[PDB]
Each structure stands twice: as structure tokens, then as C-alpha cells.
Design a protein around this ligand. Structure first.
Ligand SMILES: Nc1nc2c(ncn2[C@@H]2O[C@H](COP(=O)(O)OP(=O)(O)OP(=O)(O)O)[C@@H](O)[C@H]2O)c(=O)[nH]1
Ligand SMILES: [Mg+2]
Lengths: 171, 916
């Protein structure tokens, strides 16, 4: 009876997808970059004024040497988040490939573009991040895992787009 | 062995089944790839199989091709088993799937991806059948599946060497032209052909500054043919029964034209064609605006209009006829009108309005493209079109359905850098300002029209500041009205519009000189009241705009003998509250830093006492409330520390900091340095504490020496990270510069702590910081430092030899002149001691005397220079240090230097002799 939505996390290594998912799952934040092999499936539960939304996040590996059968995971997905570190402009430059591979396997799904770790130093990609989403109708959010700047916004937007009720809000 | 079982298990969410399924798949395919590839192709071709399984089969075949196809891949795995008999089969399977119109889009996409992966190595020379089948299907059957396949092929794998020297370019261009020229081809086929044209243009544009006539002629001919064909297509017409497809057709046509115009040399795109396509694009705006009167339809209308306006922006350098200009305005008014969904969103949530108007919104409507269009216009066209938009505004004062869009176009025109001048604008601008005043004065006006009036008036005044003789009274009246209409209404959107208008007034007018001190004070009070009312519901980067407006307000803070204390207290209350709410927003943080700096530029030791009691108790409460969590990382804690450090750093130059601030800050700063562990928290707290020590009065700090020393010992003890320990330098510098007499009994503890942390730490930057600290210690008192280092032992071994080894190794690693100078002066001071107990230690990096290696390294530095610690800044170049060192040496302090020079290479001795 409880609705469930499959979420695939994509983005290069070092963009803090695992820290973001772990923060949502437990509230702890782990400081040491450990590589991810394959994918980890984590059930996230968000309470709302209109019942429960329960995403099943697929934390896909961001390293090509570890991305074994990575495209095999996007099948029958219902939403996706493209993560990139604003500290590494190459990751933003590689974001279009992530969007291409996402829309190939599951087209027209709601996809959120998330610039992780705005807190580190100063933005190295500045406002260029607006250029990609403005055409493909993604929504860009500055988020972080060291500080909870916007950590709930991507899931809130995905819940609004999937449940069809823009007035839904997390509590 | 059952491929279906593997492809079912691999999709399972549970870790165990997925990993074992993938391991079995890889082991099977490494054992015999020919069977696995054939099975995957079969289950991809079996229409009876579930779509998820077919798509997983194709996406797994894509990966297996990357590993076992053939050498030349950067990840090709040895001992493949894919004989040509399997490749020929699966190529046929893929080129059957990728163009079977009955197949679902996902399977076609997977097949095209696999074909692209194969073509990354096998194309074109190994697989001409691919190109033969694509060209056959496109030219004879107009199969848009094959056109999409070719378009994706050009995206990933085709390169300019294949495009120009190979047959790809000419053949593709001929096929595309043949498809476009024939009227029989369906509109969707034309769209696919134009997408192929766009890909070919991108191929021609990626390389530039060509140097081969074989390419230039081909490019020029293809450009001429493509422009002729696009003109013919734009001259073609449709029955308007498939308007969404016509909108996509026009959208891709103008995308091609904007690409040609913006990314190719002007030579190939004649100005006559510019003038023709200008008229064509204007007629297409008219057509799209008529079509719009008929939700996905509106979206495609806006998408097509964006590209048409982009083309007009590129052409904009051309002259626009008055009737063409009027058509452009009449179309942009219909196109720039706010959708009912956006009107509802702005009415219900002013935060989206603030995000959009501040330019931080994650969107790009037709309105932004119109802004770009009017911004790019040249001065004559801008001056003509301003009259048109002003006349349309004047005639449409009662037409509230469109007036908002007219005000937006007027704003966009006034954003243009060029100064609008013309024959009779003076009459026009008077009518315009009277209309805006009537809009402000009127009642029952829709809130969005009023909000557009409020933001347009500052642009009107700014653009025509050189033409209005009554600019001061008009600015005063309009500002007063904008503030009154925000105070006297409950629509927070209007309040946000008013504060944005206020920051636009601040960016052009010196309000503090035109309004007068009393009017300026009253406007500051009104704006802070508005900000206070708005802050109760701020979100989504509304706080950043509030902070910017507050910065502009405090930038007009009156002189100290006249400033109102209550206004300043409210200003600080706002800059604190708005930044404490949503503290993680980096923009809010930096703007609050700038606001505090602006609020503390006008301080003195008299009023600084009043500033202490206002500011400090707010920070002390947060420091106390963070004590329970052991001062762990938190955005609010870092924020209050970054405010404390700014308040300290903005010291009154008249003299030392008052004892009051020291008595306030010492206890919580000591506690956070003694208990915290987060790197950022320790760094900020050390930055504050060191400055407090450096600028505290000597007689006030003397009783607290033991506490300071204990804090330093903890801050460099092992239970804190080395990166946080990096900041130890400034604290020791402040201690020595402050306690210049009391440090004598306890200096041994400092040396012990520095040397122990130096020998423990691995981190390079931490090693450098401890080396700087030890350098400062040695330069202050070389005798005590050497006595302690030689006498004290760690792990039953004297510290001296280990620290010499690490010091010389790090100096050999150290870079940057600033750090080199400190080591230069330290080693020279050690040399000038002339005590045998140092120089008799043997060191190697051949074993040589310690002083000998010191002078050898100094020589090596002099050879290098021949061509940020700042703890010993003297602002003197390394060259004069070197020459004074060698001249003191040549003054024969110790005779060993001559023996070493004769031992050293003749070239080095010659370099020394030529340097001095
Ligand atoms: N400063 C800062 N560091 C962060 C933030 N989020 C994560 N990190 C750190 O950056 C690294 C991110 O690690 P992961 O979450 O595994 O990164 P990833 O790209 O998802 O890694 P893979 O899953 O292996 O591809 C870790 O060292 C985190 O502690 C953040 O918001 N700010
Ligand atoms: Mg990871």
C-alpha cells in the first residue's frame, strides 16, 4: 500500500553521493572518501502531510573502472539525481553524458541536477551550472553533505513531481 | 548457464543475488564469450521477452562489447572468444533492432547505443554495411529511425578526420539535401534531416582556422546550399493541422540558423540573407503569436519563440523597419505575458518572484531571451524601439491583461548599456513617468503590474538621469511612494518588489546626498521595517536579497555624532537574525560578513564600548549553547565564529582592544579550543583567539598566561587533527609579541610541544607550519632553543639529530620564497652562534658536517634564484639576505668556510665570487 519510487544516483567519484545518501539514511556524515563498488540500495523514508514517501535510492558507482553493468541499473527507474561537485569543473563538464545515459534507458523521467558541497572553498563552476538545466528542463539545486543547506530539496521536488501534488511537504 | 536466470537475478535489488549474478555472467563470458553474446542477442531479439529483460540484455551487451570485442579498446580484456561468426550475427541483430519501427523506443535506444559502441572501433573501415544500410534507408524509405541512428553516430564517434577526408561528409550532406528538397518527405523526416544538418554543422564548427582548400570549398558550398534550403523551407507553408510538429520544425530551423550565424565566419552567411531571414523570423513571430491563441502546445510555442528571438538577437545589428519593429513589439507582448501558472505561483509564493527577479531562478523563459534581445540592440534601434514601447504602454494603460509584459520590455530596454537619445524622447519620457506615477497612485491594480511598475521606475530614472532636470524631486517622490505602497499592504510580493527597487535606487543614486540626512534616516527606517516584515517568511534565497538590501541601507549609515542608536541596533538585529536563520547559505554568510564590515567601518574606542554590549552577548549565547555538543561542526557555530573574528579584526586603530571584549571572549574561546575537534571550528576559533591575544592589553592578559599555554598545548596535542594544528603559528606569534617578558620560564614547554608535534606529524603543510614556529622560536632566542632541543630526548633518543634530519628534508621539499627567507635567517642565526656542539653532527641527504650542509644548501638557493606564513615578514628580498650572510662569513667568523669552498665544486665557488 505504501508507495515506493526507485531513485538512481549518478555522478562522478568524489561528488559525495554516498555521504548524501548516508546522511539521509542515518544522519551521520563520514569524512573519508571510500570508493563505491557496484551499487548500494538504501530505503529512505520521508514523512509528509499526505502520508509516507519511500524512495529506494540506488547509489551507483561514479568510477568507470567500478561501474560494472552500471547501465543495467537504470531500467524501470522512476527518477534520478545527477550529482556533481562544484569543486571539480570536470564533473560538471561530464554531467551531460550522465543525463544522456539516464534519458536513454528511462526517458522523460524527472531528473534533478545537484551541485554538491557548495561549502568547500568557493564555487569553482559559478553560474555555468544554469546553462545545462535551462534547456533540458531539469531543476538545479545547490546542496551539501557537510552542511544541510538544501539536503531535503531534491527529494521534496521528486515527491511533488511523482505524487502529482505540488502542495506536498516534508515534516 | 541459463541466460534468462542471470538477467533476472542481476536486476534484483538485494546485494547477494545481484553480485552473484554479475559474477556468474562475467565468469561465463570470460570462459566462452561466443555463447554469451549469442544468448544476449537472442533474448534481445525475442519479442516475447519482457521489455525490462530485453533492455537489460542490450545494455549488458554494450558493456561486454567494451571488454571482449577486439583490441584497441582502452579496457579490452585478453583471451576473448568472439569469432567473426558471432560479430556478423550480432551486427545484423543490432541493425535489425535499431530500425524496426515496431520496436519500443527503449529497445531502439539500446540497439543504437550498442551500434555506437561497436562503431567506436569498427567504423567505418571495418563495417561499410552500416553506412550502406543507413544511407539506403534514409534516401529510399525516409526511415527516421536510421536518421536518429546516424545523428547519434555523429554525436559520439565520428571525428573531423572521418568527416572531411572520409566519405562521411559529402555523402551525408547530399543525402540530407535530397531529403529536405523533396516535398514528399514527411515533416518528421524533415525534422530528423535538420537535426542531422545541425550535427554536420557542429562537426564543421568544432575545428576552426582551417588551412586546407579541400575543406574550405566544401564547407562554403554546403553552407550556401543549406542556407538556400532553409530559406525555401521557411517559405514553405502547412495546413496548420499538426501545429506542434510545425513548431518543432521552425524551432530546429532557427536553431540551425543561430548556430550558423554565431559559430561560423561572417563570410559564408551573406548580409542579404540576414535581411531576408530577419523578415522571415518576424513573420514567424507573428504566426506563432496567432497560433498561441488556439499545456504542451504553449510549451512548444515558448520553445520556438526562444529560438526565433535568439535569431533576432544575432541579426539585431541590422536595421529594423518601423513596421517590423512594431510587429516585434506586438509579438513579444503576447509572448512575454506571464502564464497563469506562473502568475499563481508568484501570487501564492513571493519567494519564486524574488528568485526570478534576483536572477537566481533555475529557469529560462522567453522573457529572459527577450531581455537578451533588447540588451544587445544597437543605439539607433534601441532609441527607436523605446519610443514604440513607450507609446504602446501609453495606449495600453487600461489593458491590464498586457501592461505587465509592456513594463517588462521597457525594463529590458532600460537595462541596455547604450544611452537612449533621439529627436523627441523628452515628451515620451514625461508621459512614461506620468503613467508610472498614475500606476503607483491608482487602486485595485493587479499586484504583478504594480510590482513591475515599482522595479521599472529605478531603471527609468537611471537611464534618463542625464535628461531629467527634476531628477532629485522625482527620485524622492518615487522612493517615498514605493516605500508607502509596501508598508500599507499585506502582499509580501509588493514588499519584495519595493526592496528590490530600493537596491536599484542605491545602485545609481547617491541617496545620502540627494535626500538629505533626515529623509535618508526615515527611508532607512522604512526599509528596515519592510525587511523585518518580509523576513518572517523568507526562503529560497530571499535571505540573500534581504542581506543585499540591508547592506545598501547600512552603506548610508549617518556620521557618528548624528547616527540614531536605535536604527543601528535594529540594523544589527536584522543582520544577525536573517543570517542565523538559514545559516548554511554561503551567499548569506559572505553578505553578512560584508554587512558587519560596513557596520564596523565607522567605529572608535568611545562607541566601540557600545558596540561590544550590542554584538558580543549574541555570540556568547551561541557559543554557550554549542558547548553541549562538544562544539562539533555546525553552520551556526562557524557563522558566529566568523562574526567574532571580524569584530576582533575591525579593531579601532586608535589603540588596543578594550578589556571588556577580552573578558567576554576569553572563556568561551578557551573552552572551544580545549574541547572542539572539527577542523573548521578549530581553525576559526584559533584565528579569533590569536588575534585577541595579539591585540589584548598586556596588563589585562598577564593573569591568563597559564590558561593560554594550556590551550596552546591542547591545540597542538595529538587528540586534534594536523590540519587544525596548522594554525598553531599565529597563536605562538601573538603570545611572543604580547608576553615578551613572561614567556621566559615557560618557553621550554613551548619548545617541547613544538618539537614533539613536529616529529609526530606526517602532514606536509603541518610540518611546514611547525617549522615556521620553530624558526620563529630560534630567531627569538637561539641559545635557549638549541639548549632545549639538544638536552630533551624523545623515545630515549635526543631530539636534535631527528629534528635536523626532518628540517633539512623539509627544506629540500619546501617551495615558495616567503618560507625560504625564514629558513635562511634561522640557519644564518644558527651559523652565527659558532658553537661546535651543533656543527659536529654528521648529516647526509656523502655524510658532511651540519654547518657544511647548511652552507651548501644556501649556495644551492643562491644558484636557483640566479635564474605565506608571514611569521617573520621583513619585506626584504632574499638576495640581500644572501649577500649579507656570505659577507659575514667572508669576515672569517670560522675558518671552515674556505675549506668547504675549496671542497665544493669550482662552478659554485665561481658563482659565489661573481655574486659577491
Ligand atoms: N566539505 C564537504 N565534503 C563533503 C561533502 N559531502 C561529502 N564530502 C566528502 O567528500 C567525499 C565524498 O565521498 P562519497 O560520498 O563516497 O562520494 P561519491 O562521489 O558518492 O563516491 P562514490 O560513491 O564512490 O562514487 C568524502 O570524503 C566526504 O566526506 C560536503 O557537503 N562537503
Ligand atoms: Mg563513493
Amino acid at each position: 500500500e505504501v508507495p515506493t519510487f526507485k531513485l538512481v544516483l549518478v555522478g562522478d567519484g568524489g561528488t559525495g553521493k554516498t555521504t548524501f545518501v548516508k546522511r539521509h539514511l542515518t544522519g551521520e556524515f563520514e569524512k573519508k572518501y571510500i570508493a563505491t563498488i557496484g551499487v548500494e540500495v538504501h530505503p529512505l523514508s520521508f514523512y509528509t502531510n499526505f502520508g509516507e514517501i519511500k524512495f529506494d535510492v540506488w547509489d551507483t558507482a561514479g568510477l568507470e573502472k567500478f561501474g560494472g553493468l552500471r547501465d543495467g541499473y537504470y531500467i524501470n527507474a522512476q527518477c534520478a539525481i545527477i550529482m556533481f561537485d562544484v569543486t571539480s569543473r570536470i564533473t560538471y563538464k561530464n554531467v551531460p553524458n550522465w543525463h544522456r545515459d539516464l534519458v536513454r534507458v528511462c526517458e522523460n523521467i524527472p531528473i534533478v541536477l545537484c551541485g554538491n558541497k557548495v561549502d568547500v572553498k568557493e564555487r569553482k563552476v559559478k553560474a555555468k551550472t544554469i546553462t545545462f538545466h535551462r534547456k533540458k528542463n531539469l531543476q538545479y539545486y545547490d546542496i551539501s553533505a557537510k552542511s544541510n543547506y538544501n539536503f531535503e530539496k531534491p527529494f521534496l521536488w521528486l515527491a511533488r513531481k511523482l505524487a502529482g501534488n505540488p502542495q506536498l511537504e516534508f515534516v | 548457464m541459463d541466460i534468462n536466470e542471470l538477467i533476472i537475478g542481476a536486476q534484483s535489488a538485494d546485494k547477494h543475488t545481484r553480485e552473484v549474478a554479475e559474477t556468474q555472467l562475467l565468469q561465463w563470458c570470460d570462459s566462452d564469450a561466443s555463447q554469451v553474446f549469442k544468448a544476449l542477442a537472442n533474448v534481445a531479439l525475442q519479442h516475447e521477452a519482457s521489455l525490462e529483460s530485453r533492455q537489460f540484455a542490450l545494455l549488458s551487451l554494450r558493456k561486454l562489447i567494451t571488454m571482449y570485442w577486439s583490441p584497441g579498446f582502452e579496457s579490452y580484456r585478453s583471451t576473448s572468444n568472439v569469432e567473426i561468426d558471432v560479430k556478423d550475427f550480432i551486427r545484423e541483430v543490432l541493425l535489425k533492432l535499431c530500425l524496426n519501427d515496431n520496436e519500443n523506443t527503449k529497445i531502439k535506444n539500446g540497439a543504437s547505443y550498442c551500434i555506437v559502441q561497436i562503431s567506436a572501433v569498427d567504423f567505418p573501415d571495418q563495417w561499410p554495411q552500416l553506412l550502406t544500410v543507413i544511407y539506403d534507408a534514409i534516401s529510399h524509405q525516409h526511415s527516421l529511425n536510421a536518421m536518429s541512428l546516424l545523428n547519434e553516430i555523429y554525436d559520439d564517434v565520428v571525428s573531423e578526420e572521418m568527416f572531411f577526408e572520409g566519405g562521411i561528409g559529402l555523402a551525408t550532406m547530399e543525402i540530407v539535401f535530397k531529403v529536405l528538397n523533396t516535398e514528399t518527405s514527411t515533416l518528421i523526416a524533415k525534422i530528423a534531416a535538420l537535426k542531422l544538418l545541425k550535427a554536420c554543422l557542429l562537426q564543421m564548427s568544432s575545428h576552426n582556422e582551417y588551412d586546407e582548400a579541400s575543406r574550405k570549398s566544401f564547407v562554403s558550398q554546403c553552407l550556401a546550399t543549406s542556407l538556400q534550403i532553409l530559406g525555401q523551407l521557411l517559405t514553405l507553408n502547412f495546413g496548420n493541422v499538426d501545429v506542434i510538429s510545425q513548431l518543432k520544425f521552425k524551432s530546429i530551423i532557427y536553431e540551425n540558423l543561430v548556430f550558423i550565424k554565431n559559430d561560423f565566419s561572417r563570410k559564408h552567411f551573406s548580409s542579404e540573407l540576414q535581411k531576408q531571414f530577419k523578415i522571415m523570423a518576424i513573420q514567424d513571430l507573428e504566426n506563432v503569436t496567432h497560433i498561441n491563441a488556439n499545456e504542451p502546445l504553449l510549451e512548444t510555442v515558448h520553445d520556438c519563440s526562444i529560438y526565433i528571438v535568439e535569431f533576432l538577437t544575432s541579426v539585431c545589428t541590422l536595421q529594423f523597419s518601423v513596421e517590423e519593429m512594431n510587429k516585434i513589439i506586438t509579438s513579444l507582448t503576447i509572448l512575454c505575458q506571464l502564464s497563469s501558472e506562473t502568475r499563481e505561483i508568484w501570487t501564492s509564493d513571493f519567494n519564486t518572484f524574488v528568485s526570478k527577479e534576483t536572477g537566481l531562478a533555475a529557469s529560462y523563459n522567453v522573457r529572459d531571451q527577450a531581455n537578451e534581445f533588447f540588451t544587445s540592440l544597437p543605439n539607433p534601434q534601441l532609441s527607436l524601439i523605446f519610443k514604440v514601447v513607450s507609446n504602446d504602454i501609453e495606449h495600453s494603460t487600461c489593458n491590464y491583461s498586457t501592461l505587465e509584459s509592456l513594463l517588462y520590455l521597457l525594463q529590458c530596454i532600460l537595462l541596455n548599456d547604450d544611452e537612449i537619445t533621439g529627436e523627441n524622447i523628452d515628451q515620451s519620457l514625461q508621459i512614461l513617468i506620468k503613467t508610472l506615477e498614475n500606476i503607483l497612485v491608482s487602486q485595485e491594480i493587479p499586484e504583478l503590474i504594480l510590482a513591475r511598475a515599482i522595479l521599472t521606475i529605478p531603471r527609468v530614472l537611471d537611464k534618463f538621469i542625464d535628461a531629467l532636470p527634476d531628477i532629485k524631486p522625482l527620485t524622492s517622490a518615487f522612493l517615498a511612494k514605493s516605500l508607502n505602497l509596501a508598508l500599507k499592504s499585506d502582499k509580501e510580493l509588493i514588499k519584495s518588489a519595493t526592496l528590490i527597487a530600493f537596491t536599484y535606487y542605491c545602485y545609481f543614486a547617491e541617496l545620502d546626498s540627494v535626500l538629505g540626512p533626515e529623509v535618508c534616516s526615515e527611508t532607512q527606517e522604512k526599509v528596515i521595517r519592510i525587511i523585518n516584515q518580509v523576513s518572517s517568511d523568507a526562503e529560497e534565497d530571499t535571505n540573500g536579497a534581504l542581506m543585499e538590501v540591508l547592506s545598501q541601507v547600512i552603506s548610508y549609515n549617518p556620521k557618528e555624532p548624528h547616527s540614531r542608536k536605535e536604527i543601528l541596533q535594529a540594523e544589527f538585529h536584522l543582520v544577525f537574525t536573517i543570517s542565523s536563520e538559514d545559516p548554511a547559505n554561503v551567499q548569506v554568510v559572505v553578505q553578512s560578513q560584508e554587512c558587519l564590515e560596513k557596520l564596523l567601518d565607522n567605529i572608535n574606542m568611545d562607541n566601540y564600548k557600545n558596540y561590544i554590549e550590542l554584538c558580543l552577548p549574541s555570540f556568547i549565547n551561541v557559543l554557550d549553547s554549542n558547548n553541549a555538543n562538544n562544539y562539533r561542526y555546525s553552520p551556526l557555530l562557524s557563522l558566529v565564529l566568523e562574526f567574532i573574528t571580524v569584530f576582533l579584526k575591525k579593531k579601532p586603530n586608535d589603540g588596543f582592544l578594550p578589556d571588556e571584549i577580552n573578558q567576554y571572549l576569553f572563556e568561551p574561546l578557551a573552552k572551544v579550543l580545549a574541547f572542539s575537534t572539527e577542523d573548521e571550528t578549530l581553525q576559526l576559533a584559533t584565528e579569533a583567539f590569536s588575534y585577541l591575544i595579539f591585540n589584548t592589553d598586556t596588563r589585562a592578559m598577564e593573569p591568563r598566561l597559564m590558561d593560554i599555554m594550556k590551550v596552546l598545548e591542547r591545540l597542538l596535542s595529538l587528540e586534534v587533527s594536523d590540519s587544525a594544528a596548522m594554525n598553531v603559528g599565529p597563536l605562538v606569534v601573538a603570545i611572543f609579541t604580547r608576553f615578551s617578558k613572561e614567556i621566559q620560564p615557560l618557553i621550554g614547554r613551548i619548545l617541547e610541544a613544538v618539537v614533539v608535534r613536529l616529529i609526530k606529524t606526517q602532514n606536509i603543510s603541518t610540518e611546514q607550519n611547525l617549522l615556521s614556529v620553530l624558526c620563529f622560536l630560534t630567531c627569538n632566542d637561539p641559545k635557549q632553543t638549541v639548549d632545549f632541543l639538544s638536552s630533551f630526548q624523545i623515545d630515549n633518543t635526543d631530539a636534535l639529530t631527528l629534528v635536523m634530519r626532518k628540517w633539512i628534508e623539509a627544506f629540500e621539499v619546501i617551495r615558495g620564497e616567503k618560507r625560504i627567507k625564514e629558513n635562511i635567517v634561522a640557519l644564518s642565526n644558527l651559523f652565527f652562534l659558532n658553537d661546535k656542539r651543533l656543527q659536529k653532527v654528521v648529516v647526509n641527504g656523502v655524510q658532511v658536517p651540519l654547518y657544511t650542509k647548511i652552507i651548501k644548501l644556501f649556495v644551492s638557493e643562491l644558484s636557483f634564484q640566479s635564474k605565506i606564513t608571514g611569521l617573520m615578514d621583513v619585506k626584504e628580498s632574499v638576495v640581500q639576505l644572501l649577500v649579507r650572510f656570505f659577507k659575514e662569513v667572508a669576515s672569517k667568523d670560522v675558518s671552515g668556510f674556505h675549506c668547504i669552498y675549496e671542497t665544493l665544486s669550482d662552478s659554485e665557488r665561481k658563482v659565489l665570487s661573481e655574486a659577491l
